[model samples]
Target: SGAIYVGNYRVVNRHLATHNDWANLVWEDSSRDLLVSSTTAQGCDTIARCDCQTGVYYCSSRRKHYPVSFSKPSLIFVEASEYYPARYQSHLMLAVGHSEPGDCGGILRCQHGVVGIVSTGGNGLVGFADVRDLLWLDE
Candidate 1:
């Protein structure tokens, strides 16, 4: 199946500074950086160029923002081969039930620059992807 969303931790969200979303479905990290996701079909280039939803900061509407102490983005490669980590595995990430974007289930954790990936319409997300993954993404 086509990936619900593909990201590049290296360039995730690093240039945004605003949000047109009405619900204002936005959150900032304790460090005061913003997490950005896609609201439209921004394509991979846009994802890299404008640094869309790679998960860090992109086109987010904020004062204290944009590459401004903004959390840099990150994305990992080589799928876990299907879903769910093996027995005794520590990722604890769950394969999603839907096929639309943002399909996942996790601990729903947060931090000072951690962004969220809401699926199909503000359904919210889990920690299926975390800091370590982000660390790898930056590589």
Candidate 2:
């Protein structure tokens, strides 16, 4: 099991990489005030750390004020790939949750990314960031 310490928290996961001790590349959904990456950055992930904060993302590579999102939630992508702002896209995500003002703890949201604040019996949580490395490819 590999691990790295971010501030006082030590995360044991694959995506939580750091070429520098400060920058990392993990996913954030307005839940907490932390981030992850591999290699370089100038600390832009902490500004819009939570939902109450402004909803803006800077490019991780260039630290640009305008960043890009998935062109329909692709598994892997390239820089020059054509992108059109997507809608109703299915996504794989890890998230922090609440029972109303307190942490209900970590959960996954691996369904329609449009389904926010699921109040029903939904089955999808992309595997706690590492649990389900993949789902089946069916026909």
Candidate 3:
């Protein structure tokens, strides 16, 4: 049986430069398909989702006076294992977005139990692939 995953993290809104906020999501995966449970974050968070799959800069739901920032927002995949290796021990690639000076965002890899933080500058996306197993799989 698949389970729901959630995480709380801070992200900056590109359009509203002055605003910083938290992002949260609940999702579940079953035999047939994956479902979105809930999402609560400023409009900027959606960019992470778009980048994860499409690999491009997308606008936010909220309309702002300036263009969207498209910064390297933190990402948490609810059913990441379903898409990647079940072992949870492998290389995870992440693509980041361009922000400003000092932030040259790009792809990053995380090994077993290694957590990666996104760079604040540059523009791009991240992807992940696991190599080993840390959890027991019951048949």
Candidate 4:
């Protein structure tokens, strides 16, 4: 009962290959909002909305790329065992991955001999020459 609006709509289908086809639909909503649906294949389609703020209804494909590198450094610990009075050795490996676009792709790995852990910790890894120096790899 607030507002009444009407508009014309159309749907178009185009065949490219046996499995690949393009389809598009255009319509207007009650709020005068323009909507568009486009697909390169039958099962894959993208929907877009356009209102007073935006004048066009089109699908925007955003792609993110990440580059990375890694290195391994060992940590040494020398301590005598209490029970056997023998020396114990421990090693730590550091693995890091950095992305060009920023912290969106920062990863770290900590390995102790055979046991290891890989994660993007709360603080993330720092102290690198460049952001995209490392991708994703364990030391």
Candidate 5:
């Protein structure tokens, strides 16, 4: 499953900036089609580039998706180091946190909108795949 929505840790309005504690939603149970889970109604209307700051962020994921046993929703927060692309790779965003153990692929969101998706993590640091690098197709 992919991240369906990303939001600030406290559910703030979109007029302000989001803190590093932003959250992403990768899985949900109430909706059969997670893609149509209606993140827009919740506050996500567009995608955001990269910016820097420190605040609360929100995201949701299931430790393991299954028959309602291990699929309990889990929320996490990662402190961002930099919102810009990594100079070494130039395609990934950089952050710092030991909280990301199984969060790879979760979407990283801010008050502005989608930022990126969790890519790699370990050793007190995490990398995200820039959403701008994604190829969107219209149907």
Candidate 6:
């Protein structure tokens, strides 16, 4: 019919991250280099950017780096609020071993490249919007 939209971003294509390949949200466009992500930033050091096509994330503030990962490839989440009844078929689940709350829209990086963006989670597991599966996400 017509073009779908996500927040302020318009949905160019809709594909699922499930067996049926029906992704709920797939939007694109914006800064190519300064991709959105989370940062434990300090006042003195705030500049950080992901190398285009590279998973390597660079920031001015130095800290011990550790690999982030998930336990499975397929997961499900339902925002059943009466205001917005929605289902998020997340393709991967971030392994939050210690159960730290992550801000939605924060970047999730892998060894090879940026894998997903933080969607929602707490208490042990976090869900993400897998950008790796979206070929339209240009660097």
* Candidate 5 ranges with C-alpha deviation above 4 Å: 4-45, 49-90, 99-101, 133-139
**Residue lDDT tens for model 5, 4-120:** 333321221111213331344222211111111222334433565435332222323434311100111122233334332222433445566433544654555555555554544
lDDT of each: 0.25, 0.23, 0.24, 0.20, 0.36, 0.36
The root-mean-square deviation over C-alpha atoms between each candidate and the true structure, in angstroms, is: 15.4, 16.1, 15.3, 24.7, 15.4, 12.4
Tens-place lDDT per residue, model 4, 63-136, is 32222233332322322322122222122222232222222212221121111112111223321111111112
Clashes of each: 13, 7, 20, 5, 12, 6
Q: Is candidate 3 or candidate 4 better by TM-score?
A: 3
lDDT of 5: 0.36
Error of model 5, residue 83, in angstroms: 26
Per-residue lDDT over 45-116 for candidate 6, one digit per residue giving the tens place of the 0 to 100 score: 112222223232211123223344464446565454322245545454545432232244344555444555
Per-residue lDDT tens digits for candidate 1, residues 1-139, read 0111224312221112234421333332312112334344433321122322333322211212122121233321222223322123222222222222222211122233333321111122121222334333222
Clashing pairs in 4: 68-134, 68-135, 69-133, 69-134, 69-135
> What residue runs in model 3 are displaced by over 4 Å at the alpha carbon?
1-6, 11-18, 22-107, 118-139
Clashing pairs in 2: 19-39, 24-36, 24-37, 25-36, 25-37, 108-125, 109-125
lDDT of 2 at 43: 23
Task: Indicate the TM-score of model 6.
Answer: 0.44
Task: Indicate the worst ten consecutive residues by lDDT in candidate 2.
Answer: 45-54
| Cα-based lDDT at residue 55, candidate 1 | 33
Q: Say which candidate scores most in TM-score.
A: 6
> With candidate 6 superimposed using the best TM-score fit, by how many Å does residue 125's alpha carbon deviate from the native?
1.6
Where is model 5 poorest over a 10-residue stretch in terms of lDDT? 65-74
Better of 2 and 5 by lDDT: 5
What would the TM-score be for candidate 1 when compared with the true structure? 0.21
| Runs with alpha carbons beyond 4 Å of true place in candidate 2 | 1-7, 10-13, 16-54, 67-139
Q: How many backbone clashes does candidate 3 have?
A: 20
TM-score against truth, every candidate: 0.21, 0.19, 0.17, 0.16, 0.39, 0.44
- Over 14-40, each residue of candidate 3 has an lDDT whose tens digit, in order, gives 211221211232322232122233334
List runs of model 1 lying over 4 Å from the truth. Answer: 1-86, 93-109, 115-129
lDDT at 1 for candidate 3? 16
